[PDB]
Amino acid sequence: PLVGTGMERAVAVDSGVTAVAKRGGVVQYVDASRIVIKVNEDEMYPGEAGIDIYNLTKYTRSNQNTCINQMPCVSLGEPVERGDVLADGPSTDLGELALGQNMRVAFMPWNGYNFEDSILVSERVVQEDRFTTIHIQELACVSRDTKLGPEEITADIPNVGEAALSKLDESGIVYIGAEVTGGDILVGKVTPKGSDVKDSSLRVPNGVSGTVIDVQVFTRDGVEKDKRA
Amino acid sequence: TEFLKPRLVDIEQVSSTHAKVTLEPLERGFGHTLGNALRRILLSSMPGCAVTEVEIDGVLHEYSTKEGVQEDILEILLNLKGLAVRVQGKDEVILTLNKSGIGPVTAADITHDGDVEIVKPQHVICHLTDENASISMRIKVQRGRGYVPASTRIHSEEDERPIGRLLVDACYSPVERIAYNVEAARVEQRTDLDKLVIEMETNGTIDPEEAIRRAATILAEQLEAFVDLR
Amino acid sequence: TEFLKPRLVDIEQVSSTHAKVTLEPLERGFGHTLGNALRRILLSSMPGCAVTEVEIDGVLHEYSTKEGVQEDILEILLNLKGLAVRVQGKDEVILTLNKSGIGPVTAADITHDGDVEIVKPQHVICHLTDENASISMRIKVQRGRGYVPASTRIHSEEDERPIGRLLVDACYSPVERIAYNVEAARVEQRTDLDKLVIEMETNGTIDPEEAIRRAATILAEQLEAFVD
Amino acid sequence: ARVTVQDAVEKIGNRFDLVLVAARRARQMQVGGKDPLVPEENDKTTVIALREIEEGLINNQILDVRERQEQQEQEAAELQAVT
Amino acid sequence: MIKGKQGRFRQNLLGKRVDYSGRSVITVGPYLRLHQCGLPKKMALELFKPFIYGKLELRGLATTIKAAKKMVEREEAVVWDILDEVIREHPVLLNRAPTLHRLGIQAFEPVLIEGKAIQLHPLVCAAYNADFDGDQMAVHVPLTLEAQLEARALMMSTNNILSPANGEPIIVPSQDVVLGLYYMTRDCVNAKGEGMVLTGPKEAERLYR
Amino acid sequence: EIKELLKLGDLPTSGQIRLYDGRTGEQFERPVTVGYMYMLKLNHLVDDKM
RNA sequence: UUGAUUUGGUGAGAGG
Ligand SMILES: [Mg+2]
C-alpha cells in the first residue's frame, strides 16, 4: 500500500503467516524446499553447531478456500538479523501487509457505468492478472459399505462410455494435473448390485474448473489398483 | 475542394521503444479526428507476437515448485508473459532455453533460431541458485491481436495437444501507450494548418512507420464499406 | 489477422431529409471510431455554399427596424440563415430580392440567375403588412466548408464595409444534425461486437447517404497517402 | 413490437380483463388452430394478441361471436354429415 | 410443526420454494430501455430448459428428449439461436430480496448478457431500493400464457411509473443524471458564444460539438 | 504536506489533472481527480452467487 | 423400463 499507516509491519509479522527468522546470520538458500540460514556465532549455541532450516508452506487450502502460500523474499548469501522476515506469506510484500492493490483511479461519472456504487475498470487491470486470485477446493470421495456389499474404486465405470476413463489412470481415480471443469470424473467410486450398477463416482461440481494440485489417500488398507501403493 | 494531403515528414527515435513521429500537413480541424482514430486503432488492433504455451520438463502443473530456482512457476509464467519477441517469416515458432549454473537466467540465454529476434537481452526469468540445478523450457510463440485468455483458449484450440503444456495468457498487442498532439504547423504561406505529433510507446518489436501504415490501411478498408456501398 | 467487413443493412428513410443507417457488425471499439470520425468531418469540414452577407436598405446595423413587416431584422437574418441555396459554377454570387404587396415573401420570389437555384421555394423569408412597403436586400452567397459564425466573422474582418451590410452565420455544410449510437450485435460465437446506428438530418441540396459517402471519401482521400 | 399496452387498456377499459381476453386469444393461436387477424413481425402469441386488441378487432364480444359461429358450423357439419 | 415462524403456514404454504428461478448479483448496464433488463446466457439457458427442449423438438434437429438434454449439456452452436427465439417476447419477474411494496417485483424483457450479473436499468433501482454495493436479485419465469400476459400487462416496468402510495413518480432520475442535467441547463456570465443568436436547437448542439 | 509532496513530484498542486476522453478524443471540462487508491477484492465473487 | 440423498435440527460467522 502506497498510502499506509506503518502498522502494516506489526500485523504482518505478529500474525504468523510470514517466516520470521529465529536466529540471525547469513544464508545457504537451497530454498526450492527450504530456506537454509547459517547462524552468526554470537547467537549460536556452543554445542549443536546448527543452521536453521525454514519450511515454506506452498500452495494449500485456507479456511475460506483462498490460497495460503509463502515465497522467499531474501536472495542467496544475504545477511538477515533476528526478528527479520524471510518468506512473505499470503497478502504480504517484503514484510508489509498487502491486502489489495494500488490503482490509478479517476473520480468522474463515466457514461452511467458507475451509477450507484458501481466501479468501472479498464482492461489493463484484467490483462495484468492484478486481481486474478487463486482458490483451492478440497473434494472428498469415500466408498463406505452402506449395504449390499462394499462400493468400488474402479475406472470400469458403467452405462457412460469413453467419457469416464479419461482424466484417470489406466484403471482408476483422477491422474494428477489437467484442466478439469464441470461434469468430469475424478474418483471412479461405484458398486455392483447397488444395469442395476450405478454412478456415485465423485465428479467435479457444476460450473467450476481447475487443476488437481494434490491427491491424498490414507484409504481402507488395500487401495493399490495394480501395485502403486 | 481545396484540401491537401499529409505525409510522414520526420520520424525521430528517442529510444528503441519510446519514439515519436510527425504528420504534415493536416487540414483545419482534422488533427483531433485523425489523432483519436489512429489512437483507437493503434491501441486495439495491432499484430504482435507473444508467449502462448510454456513446456518445462518434469513439471506437471503450474502451481508446483522446482529444484534450484527462485521464482516459483507462476512467477516464471508471469515473467515469460512479459516477453517481447519479433519473428519475421513464420507465424508460429518454438524457442528453447537451456541453462545450468548459479546465477540469473536472462532472456539472452535462449538458443535463438535465425528468424526470431529477442529484443530484451536483460529480461530476467529465473534465478538459478544450485549449481546442480537445470532448467529446460520450450516456449511456443504464436501471433495475433487483442487479448485471448486461457479460459477461452481451453476448448478453442483444435489441434489436439498432449497433456503437460502449461497455458499462458496471450497479450498480443505490442502498443502500450500512445499520445497525439495538434500543434501549429510552420507552413510558409498558410497559417491555418496543423501537424500531428503522435508519441508512441511500443514493445520494441514493432516498427512505428509500419504500425502507422497498418492502422491507416485498417481505417481505409473499414471506411470502404461507407464509400462503395451507399 | 483478418478484419470483419460489415454490410449496410438498412436505410430507414423517414422523410426526404432524414435517414438512419443501421450498420452491423464491427470489431469491438470500432463503431465509435467510424462514428466519431464521420461526425467531426460532417460537422466542421464538409464543403458547401450558403448566404454570408446581406445589404438591406432602411437599416444601419443589426438592431434597427424597417416598416411594413411583422418580424424584425434579427428574424429576417435568422430566416435568411435558414435558407439553403446551391451554386454550381461560380462561388461568389450576389442576389437581390424585391417584394411589394399584401402577403408574405417566400424563397420563390427571389431573382435568380442561371447558375443558382433554390431547393425549397416555399421556405418563408418574411411577411409584409403594408402594400406600399417595398423591401430590398442584396443577398451575397459565398462558398466555404463547415460552419463559421458571425461573431468570429466580425472579429476576423477588418475592412470597413458600407453601412447597411449584415453578417450572418455561414452554414456551409449541408447537414443539420448527425448523432449516432453504438449498439451490440452478435456473430454466432462472439458477443463482443458492436453495431452502428447513424442518424442524419440535412437541409435540401443533398441526400443524407450522399453526405455520408462524401464524408467517407473525404477521409479516404485524406488518408490515401501512406497506405499499402 | 411491444413496450406498453396502453391502447389495449383503452379499448378494453378494465386492465384486468385485458389479460383474460388476450389469454383466450393467445390460446386460440398457440395450440390453437386459428391464424392471426394481423401481420406478425416474428412476435409471439402474447404480443400478437395484444396487437390485435390495440387496433380494435378482438374483444370479448368478437370472441364469443366467433365461438358461436364455430358452434353453428359444427352443428351444421354434424347435421349435414349424418343427415 | 404447525405454529411459529417455521410451521406450515408461514414456511411452506404462504411462502414456497420455486422452480424456474434464479439469483445473482446485479450491475448497471445503462444502455437498456426501461422495459428490459440484462440476463446472463448461463442463467438463460438454465431457466429456459423446457422451452428450448420444445423448440428443438419442433425443428426436427433431434428426436427423443434425451438427445435434447445432451445437446444443451454440451451447449452446441445451434442452441443459442433457439435461446434468442425463446427469449424474445417473454417477460421475467425480477425481485429484490427484501420486497416491501409492490414495486419490488417488476417484469422485464431479457436481453442476453455475456457475463454472470443481472444488468438492471438504473431508474428502476429507485423503486427496488437497490444500490450496487453487492446486492442480489432473483429472477422468476412466468410459465403459462396467462402469466406472460400478466407480466406484460400488469407488472411490466413501463406500467409502474407512479408509486401506489401517492401520486409521485417512482421512475424519478436518481443521482448521476440530475448532475448531468444540472450542469447542462445552467449558465455563466461569460463563456464561448455569449449572446450570439441561433436559428434552432439543432445548431445549438452543432455549436456545442 | 500533501501539496508540498505534490510539488516535489512534478504534478499539479490541486491534485486534479485535465483528462481527455478515449471515445471522443476531446477534453473533459472542469479538471478531474486522478490518483492512486489501494483497492481490495473482497471474497464475494460473482460465480459463487450466480 | 435408463440414476441418487440434503433438507430435518443445532451452533458459529458473513452479505443486502
Ligand atoms: Mg447496498
PDB file of C-alpha atoms (C1' of nucleotides) and ligand atoms in Angstrom, chain E residues 96 131 133 135, chain G residues 16, ligand 1:
ATOM      1  CA  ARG E  96     -35.029  -7.812  -4.861  1.00  0.00           C
ATOM      2  CA  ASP E 131     -27.877   0.288  -4.969  1.00  0.00           C
ATOM      3  CA  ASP E 133     -22.851  -2.371  -3.410  1.00  0.00           C
ATOM      4  CA  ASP E 135     -26.925  -6.573  -3.980  1.00  0.00           C
TER       5      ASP E 135
ATOM      6  C1'   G G  16     -28.091  -6.620   1.300  1.00  0.00           C
TER       7        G G  16
HETATM    8 MG    MG H   1     -26.458  -1.577  -0.550  1.00  0.00          MG
END
